[PDB]
Amino acid sequence: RNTIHEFKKSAKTTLIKIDPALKIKTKKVNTADQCANRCTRNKGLPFTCKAFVFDKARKQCLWFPFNSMSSGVKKEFGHEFDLYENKDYIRNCIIGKGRSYKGTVSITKSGIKCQPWSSMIPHEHSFLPSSYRGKDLQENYCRNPRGEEGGPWCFTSNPEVRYEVCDIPQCSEV
Amino acid sequence: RRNTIHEFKKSAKTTLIKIDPALKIKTKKVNTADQCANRCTRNKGLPFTCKAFVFDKARKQCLWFPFNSMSSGVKKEFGHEFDLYENKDYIRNCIIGKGRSYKGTVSITKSGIKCQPWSSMIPHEHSFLPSSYRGKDLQENYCRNPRGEEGGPWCFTSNPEVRYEVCDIPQCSEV
């Protein structure tokens, strides 16, 4: 099957390896969907794939045994690249107030679809990605920029509900 | 309507039961479990956070739940006609310490060997059986650390020369 939509996609982004010892595998392919299928099943890869980048200009896959949180790696802007991270290795639970939560949940506790952080409809705010580096305020994911009690939250697509907390599990719950 | 049926951890012949009648549950007649997965993933038209759904193969319908098997007040229930699908977005994918309570779906050891199914005895014979003191959360070929006996979640290996090996599951506290 196609597994591309099972990854967390960061547009216009790539990863740069700084640690010489880290492995990488690259191959020319037609589409990104093909990179995802191979990463998912580690097809022909001599390591467990945690992420991959598709270079739309060169039409090439770059498979990695690391992701954007790994030491020895640096995230970087690049308009011709799209980064896809295996969600099995993107922490999906919170420890404190969800200060550093980077998961993909984008629905409020009541089920309302979150409003994109870079959007101003329905609500106006000052939570611009630019003003909160390292907070990953991309797409419409639940986040906790200021680190407020409630945990990860988001402005909602419902005009009557400015913002609402999301229902992200505590890592110790089990 | 992309198929998201694989973004869920499946538990056959199982449904969930919850007391608190204050929670909202949605139901709908469908053709396949796949149709139910897409709606939970996108969370379309659901007045709550969809964490799991059950597909009734006898009545060809699904029930979307605001909870999963790990939610308080919820219990599993056997049923030949039911298949439970839990949204992996709410199944903890990192461990704390030795991870005895790990219930994620990683199924490959640290060196990259595909895990042997717990229900299988090939290549390795073992005593980690269903009703034993060490067979509590064993399912499919997922890495597990029964009673936290090893350094972390592990599994019997599909490689005859490697009986077992630990898997590479991230610590929730590191990042």
CSV table of C-alpha atoms in Angstrom, one decimal, chain A residues 10-171:
chain,number,residue,atom,x,y,z
A,10,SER,CA,7.3,19.3,7.2
A,11,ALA,CA,7.1,21.2,4.0
A,12,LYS,CA,10.2,23.0,2.5
A,13,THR,CA,12.4,21.3,5.0
A,14,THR,CA,15.4,18.9,4.9
A,15,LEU,CA,17.9,17.5,7.4
A,16,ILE,CA,21.6,18.0,7.3
A,17,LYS,CA,23.9,15.5,8.9
A,18,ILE,CA,26.8,17.0,10.9
A,19,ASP,CA,27.9,13.7,12.5
A,20,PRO,CA,30.2,11.9,10.0
A,21,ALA,CA,29.3,8.5,11.5
A,22,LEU,CA,25.5,8.7,10.6
A,23,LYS,CA,24.3,6.5,7.7
A,24,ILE,CA,22.2,7.6,4.8
A,25,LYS,CA,20.9,6.0,1.6
A,26,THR,CA,19.8,7.9,-1.5
A,27,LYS,CA,18.1,6.9,-4.7
A,28,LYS,CA,16.5,8.5,-7.7
A,29,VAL,CA,12.7,7.7,-7.8
A,30,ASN,CA,9.6,9.2,-9.5
A,31,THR,CA,7.5,10.2,-6.5
A,32,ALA,CA,7.6,10.7,-2.7
A,33,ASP,CA,5.0,7.9,-2.2
A,34,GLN,CA,7.7,5.5,-3.3
A,35,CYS,CA,10.1,6.8,-0.7
A,36,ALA,CA,7.5,6.3,2.0
A,37,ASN,CA,6.7,2.7,1.0
A,38,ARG,CA,10.4,1.7,1.2
A,39,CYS,CA,11.0,3.6,4.5
A,40,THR,CA,8.0,1.9,6.1
A,41,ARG,CA,9.3,-1.6,5.3
A,42,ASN,CA,13.0,-0.8,5.3
A,43,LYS,CA,13.1,-2.2,1.8
A,44,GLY,CA,16.7,-2.4,0.7
A,45,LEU,CA,17.8,-0.2,3.6
A,46,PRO,CA,20.6,-1.4,5.9
A,47,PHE,CA,19.1,0.5,8.9
A,48,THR,CA,15.7,1.2,10.5
A,49,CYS,CA,14.2,4.2,8.7
A,50,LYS,CA,13.0,6.9,11.0
A,51,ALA,CA,12.6,9.6,8.3
A,52,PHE,CA,13.1,10.5,4.7
A,53,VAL,CA,13.4,13.6,2.5
A,54,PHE,CA,12.1,13.9,-1.1
A,55,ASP,CA,13.9,16.3,-3.4
A,56,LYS,CA,11.2,17.4,-5.8
A,57,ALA,CA,13.8,19.0,-8.1
A,58,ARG,CA,16.2,16.1,-8.5
A,59,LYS,CA,13.4,13.5,-7.9
A,60,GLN,CA,15.5,11.7,-5.3
A,61,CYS,CA,14.8,10.0,-1.9
A,62,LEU,CA,17.2,10.4,1.1
A,63,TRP,CA,16.4,7.8,3.8
A,64,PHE,CA,17.6,8.3,7.3
A,65,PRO,CA,18.1,6.2,10.5
A,66,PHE,CA,17.4,9.5,12.4
A,67,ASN,CA,14.9,12.3,12.5
A,68,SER,CA,14.8,16.0,13.3
A,69,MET,CA,15.3,15.4,17.1
A,70,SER,CA,18.4,13.3,16.8
A,71,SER,CA,21.8,14.6,17.9
A,72,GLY,CA,24.3,15.3,15.1
A,73,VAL,CA,21.5,16.5,12.8
A,74,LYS,CA,20.2,20.0,11.8
A,75,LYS,CA,16.9,20.9,10.3
A,76,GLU,CA,17.1,23.4,7.5
A,77,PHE,CA,14.9,25.3,5.0
A,78,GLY,CA,15.0,24.3,1.4
A,79,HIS,CA,12.1,25.0,-1.0
A,80,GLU,CA,12.7,21.9,-3.1
A,81,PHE,CA,12.6,19.5,-0.2
A,82,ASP,CA,9.8,17.9,1.9
A,83,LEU,CA,10.7,16.1,5.1
A,84,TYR,CA,8.6,13.0,6.3
A,85,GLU,CA,9.2,11.7,9.8
A,86,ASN,CA,8.0,8.2,10.9
A,87,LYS,CA,5.4,8.9,13.6
A,88,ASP,CA,6.5,5.9,15.6
A,89,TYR,CA,9.5,8.0,16.6
A,90,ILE,CA,7.7,11.3,17.2
A,91,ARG,CA,6.7,11.3,20.9
A,92,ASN,CA,2.9,11.3,21.1
A,93,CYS,CA,2.4,11.9,24.8
A,94,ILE,CA,3.2,14.9,27.1
A,95,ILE,CA,5.1,15.0,30.4
A,96,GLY,CA,4.4,18.3,32.0
A,97,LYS,CA,2.1,20.9,30.5
A,98,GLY,CA,3.2,19.7,27.1
A,99,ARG,CA,5.8,22.4,26.8
A,100,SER,CA,7.7,20.6,24.0
A,101,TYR,CA,5.0,18.4,22.5
A,102,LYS,CA,5.7,17.9,18.7
A,103,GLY,CA,3.0,15.3,17.8
A,104,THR,CA,0.4,15.7,15.1
A,105,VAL,CA,-2.9,15.8,17.0
A,106,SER,CA,-4.9,18.6,15.5
A,107,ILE,CA,-8.3,18.2,17.0
A,108,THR,CA,-9.6,19.8,20.2
A,109,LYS,CA,-11.0,17.8,23.1
A,110,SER,CA,-14.5,18.5,21.9
A,111,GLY,CA,-13.6,17.4,18.4
A,112,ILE,CA,-13.2,20.7,16.7
A,113,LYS,CA,-10.7,20.9,13.9
A,114,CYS,CA,-7.8,23.2,14.8
A,115,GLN,CA,-7.2,26.5,13.0
A,116,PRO,CA,-3.8,26.7,11.3
A,117,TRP,CA,-1.3,28.8,13.3
A,118,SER,CA,-0.5,30.9,10.3
A,119,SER,CA,-4.1,31.6,9.5
A,120,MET,CA,-6.1,34.4,11.0
A,121,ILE,CA,-9.6,33.0,10.3
A,122,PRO,CA,-11.7,32.7,12.3
A,123,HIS,CA,-9.5,34.2,15.1
A,124,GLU,CA,-6.7,36.8,15.2
A,125,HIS,CA,-3.7,36.0,17.3
A,126,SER,CA,0.0,36.8,17.8
A,127,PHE,CA,1.3,33.2,17.8
A,128,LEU,CA,3.3,33.6,14.6
A,129,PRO,CA,5.8,30.8,13.9
A,130,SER,CA,8.4,33.4,13.5
A,131,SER,CA,8.0,34.7,17.1
A,132,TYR,CA,8.2,31.2,18.6
A,133,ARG,CA,11.1,29.3,17.1
A,134,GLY,CA,11.5,25.8,18.4
A,135,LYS,CA,7.8,25.6,19.3
A,136,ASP,CA,6.9,24.0,16.0
A,137,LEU,CA,3.7,26.0,15.4
A,138,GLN,CA,3.2,24.6,11.9
A,139,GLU,CA,0.0,23.4,10.2
A,140,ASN,CA,-2.7,23.2,12.8
A,141,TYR,CA,-1.2,21.0,15.5
A,142,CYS,CA,-2.1,21.4,19.1
A,143,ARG,CA,0.8,23.2,20.9
A,144,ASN,CA,1.6,24.9,24.2
A,145,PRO,CA,3.9,27.8,23.2
A,146,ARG,CA,3.7,29.7,26.6
A,147,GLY,CA,3.6,26.4,28.5
A,148,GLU,CA,0.3,27.0,30.2
A,149,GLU,CA,-1.4,24.5,32.7
A,150,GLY,CA,-4.0,23.2,30.3
A,151,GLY,CA,-1.5,21.5,28.1
A,152,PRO,CA,-1.3,21.5,24.2
A,153,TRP,CA,-4.1,23.6,22.7
A,154,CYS,CA,-5.1,25.4,19.5
A,155,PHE,CA,-7.3,28.2,18.1
A,156,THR,CA,-10.4,26.4,16.7
A,157,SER,CA,-12.1,26.6,13.3
A,158,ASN,CA,-15.4,27.3,15.2
A,159,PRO,CA,-15.9,31.1,15.3
A,160,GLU,CA,-17.6,30.8,18.7
A,161,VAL,CA,-14.7,28.9,20.3
A,162,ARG,CA,-11.5,31.0,20.2
A,163,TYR,CA,-9.3,28.2,21.6
A,164,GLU,CA,-9.6,24.9,23.4
A,165,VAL,CA,-7.3,22.4,24.9
A,166,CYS,CA,-6.6,19.1,23.1
A,167,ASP,CA,-6.8,15.6,24.6
A,168,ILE,CA,-3.1,14.5,24.6
A,169,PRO,CA,-2.3,11.6,27.0
A,170,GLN,CA,0.3,12.0,29.8
A,171,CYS,CA,3.3,9.8,29.1
